[PDB]
């Protein structure tokens, strides 16, 4: 019934995404309302999943049925009727992750990536002057990974830390559902205009990303602490 | 009609090009082959005179009454059976040049440019790890200017000194008349040699060291092709 856009909304808090569809349409938005907030709600989370599928357009739209279908470039994959499972069995083939649970596409696809590990005084020349560019995914602080790239005027600025389902819900334990399928393995800080060109901003933008994510893999730790009797 | 594969070959050779359309249409070349050999003419003499349009695309095509139409971003811009002067006309509207004489278009039109002042080991950083960059004027060695940008998968290095037609050919004329006349109806009233634009691809576009040769490559080549349409100029007037 109207469990659709809860079920859209449950989906989102399994990434820190409060889509707050629910009410949206409680309110009598209008379909191109609904779907535009479906869409821009489904596009912050695919930053926090770590699916890394920065490469491929996300869509979410109201479907006749009462269903709300996800788009990747253009195709649906998947109805969110069809469950949590499903939506992540249709994502997995379009994934490349290595060992480390980190994504091996680019973000911008085919072209040159700089490595991860330049010298910052290097790094700067490419976030001041370069244009579109890509960094390879390196180690950062505090046992997180991170990577940079521009697309247009925008610079995104990833940190990650891959977290299984089994890691996080088990280590909530060493205190003495949803959540089985999507978790918060990542976090995207965006920078734009001047501060896009500004290397001490991009040094900032990583700690703010990473306490971001650390906050956000926290909540998912005290769920599975406190559903823990 | 012969005659207007022989304009255009004279036209090419203000820069140096030796295109040899009057040839390759004597031999009864078909239309895509000679069209073909005119826009790659077209588009390397365009690299050497400096008027400042690589944001443009450049074409020649022949057209149905015989003649040669030249295009730029697809719209035809002059007929070559209009004389060298309608195709300079057609042309100067589209340019922008500063003070120096210097085009103060990007060549990669719309985006941040890096500024001409750039120190070497920025721009080597940029050449190792970007991907489409460019940069503005900066000086360089004898009284040239120099700047470099990249597109996909080519660095392009330009060197220029820029230089009017009427100094061109005023200095031809001074020094034949020291070693012993329609100068309206010469290409060179319009057009002359000002800059050379030098191509780098695949691994060498990313090498710091290819380019610092290639600034040097581009360097002579000015040099050779100032100096060829030089005494090419100076033997007519003599």
Same mark, same amino acid.
């Given at each position: 019934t109207d469990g659709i856009y809860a079920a859209f909304?449950?989906?989102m808090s399994t990434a820190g995404?409060?889509?707050q569809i629910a009410a949206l349409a409680a309110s009598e938005a209008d379909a191109g309302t609904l779907d535009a907030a479906l869409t821009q709600s489904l596009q912050e989370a695919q930053g926090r999943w770590g699916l890394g599928l920065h490469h491929l357009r996300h869509e979410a739209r109201l479907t006749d049925d009462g269903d709300i279908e996800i788009l990747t470039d253009g195709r649906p994959s998947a109805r969110v009727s069809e469950g949590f499972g499903a939506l992540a069995q249709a994502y997995a083939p379009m994934q490349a992750?290595?060992?480390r649970g980190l994504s091996q596409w680019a973000a911008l696809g085919e072209?040159?990536?700089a490595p991860g590990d330049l010298p910052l005084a290097q790094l700067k020349v490419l976030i001041e002057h370069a244009r579109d560019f890509e960094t390879?995914?390196? $180690?950062g602080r505090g046992e997180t990974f991170q990577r940079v790239w521009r697309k247009g005027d925008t610079l995104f600025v990833e940190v990650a830390r891959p977290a299984s389902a089994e890691a996080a819900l088990s280590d909530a $334990?060493?205190?003495v559902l949803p959540e089985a399928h999507f978790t918060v393995q990542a976090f995207v800080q965006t920078l734009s205009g001047a501060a896009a060109r500004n290397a001490e901003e991009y040094r900032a933008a990583l700690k703010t990303a990473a306490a971001a994510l650390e906050e956000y893999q926290g909540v998912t730790t005290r769920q599975l602490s406190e559903v823990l009797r």
């Open positions: 909304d449950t989906l995404v409060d889509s992750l290595d060992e072209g040159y990536r390879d995914w390196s $180690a $334990a060493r205190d």
